[PDB]
Amino acid sequence: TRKGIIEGEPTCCFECVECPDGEYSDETDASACNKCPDDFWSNENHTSCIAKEIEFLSWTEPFGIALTLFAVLGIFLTAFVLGVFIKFRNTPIVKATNRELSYLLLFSLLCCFSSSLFFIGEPQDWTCRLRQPAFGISFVLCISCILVKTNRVLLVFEAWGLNLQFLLVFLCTFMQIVICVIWLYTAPPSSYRNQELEDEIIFITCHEGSLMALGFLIGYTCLLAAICFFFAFKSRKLPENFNEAKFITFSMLIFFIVWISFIPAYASTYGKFVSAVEVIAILAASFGLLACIFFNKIYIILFKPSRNTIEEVR
């Protein structure tokens, strides 16, 4: 509490008035209040200054707990599918869906699920620099593996030594990696201590250096997804590999629905939970692809292996 002038009365006759928020008076008979220093805010009685609460998506927060559980479950499912594909690597079903491409796709799916874990926790500089590029590269690799696994994609390109499948996935991912290198070399993101949205707490955000580069990452990812969707849709009715193109189409629609929904969800989320939505979108898309590429096959491989033959896989 500080002194206030009682009009007419001398200096020794003063009123007592409480300090405003953000200012404090530690000692008694104070003529003015003291603003709390940077990163500090007044306490509940304006008696002293206490540190502002540092807000971010926490690992121990129940929302973060659920998101970590879902990412762990996704990694577990991807490793399970990889294990099934490895033990049954000599079966016709695993041979048909190119085993090397399936292994690389599962590696990229593990990377996709793990990349969501770079959005939980207190944002550091390197974490913010790796968030967007990690998911971008991993998902471009996924869409490249799928996009060269379908019909009328490798044929049109082929019309050295290693398969053209790997050359195509390398080029498609290399464009993304070049974009990311240009980004983190010219305008890398950083960890920003935002003290403007709220006055009693400090948000920790990832300030992306160039929104042009982030837009380029997203545009390239969506362009590859659209190419994959179109080429699978032109061949969706084909029954090869247990209707592989139909499920590729399903996965691409799941991806597009997830990100079109990500638009308003991100544009309407404030505070720490913004990182939240990112994780969910990531997870969902990954899960989609995973299911649409493997669960069916996994069934036919583990249970009722009668169709695990060259004739049935067709």
Ligand X SMILES: CC(C)CCC[C@@H](C)[C@H]1CC[C@H]2[C@@H]3CC=C4C[C@@H](OC(=O)CCC(=O)O)CC[C@]4(C)[C@H]3CC[C@]12C
Enumerate the known binding-site residues for Ca(2+).
Answer: 8
Using CB under 6 A, which of the segments 16-24, 27-35, 128-136, 289-297 binds ligand X?
289-297
CA distance 243 to 233: 11
The least distance separating a second copy from the CB of residue 11, rounded to whole angstroms, comes to: 6
Amino acid symbol at 219: G
Nearer to Ca ion, 8 or 62 (CB): 8
The least distance separating ligand 9IG from the CB of residue 255, rounded to whole angstroms, comes to: 8
Contact with ligand X (CB under 6 A) among 50, 154, 218, 291? 291
Residue 271 falls in which region: left (phi positive, over 0), alpha (psi -120 to 50) or beta: left
Nearer to a second copy, 85 or 229 (CB): 229
Residue closest to Ca ion when measured from CB atoms: 8
- Share of the chain residues as helix, strand and coil, in percent rounded to the nearest 5: 60, 10, 30
CA distance 104 to 32: 67
Contact with ligand 9IG (CB under 6 A) among 266, 271, 299, 305? 266
Hey, CA dihedral for 179, 184, 186, 190, is it positive or negative? positive
Amino acid symbol at 64: G
Nearer to ligand X, 96 or 291 (CB): 291
The interface partner of residue 8, options being ligand X, Ca ion, ligand 9IG, none and the CB cut-off 5 to 8 Å by kind, is Ca ion
CA distance 294 to 232: 16
Nearer to ligand X, 136 or 288 (CB): 288
CA proximity to 257, closest of 294, 289, 290, 297: 289
Residues 6+ apart with CB under 8 A from 36: 22, 23, 24, 42, 49
The interface partner of residue 262, options being ligand 9IG, Ca ion, ligand X, none and the CB cut-off 5 to 8 Å by kind, is ligand 9IG
Enumerate binding residues for ligand X (CB under 6 A).
287, 291, 295-296
Enumerate binding residues for a second copy (CB under 8 A).
2-7, 9-11, 14-15, 17, 20-23, 31-32, 63, 246, 250, 253-254, 257-258, 260-265, 267-274, 276-277, 280-281, 284, 288
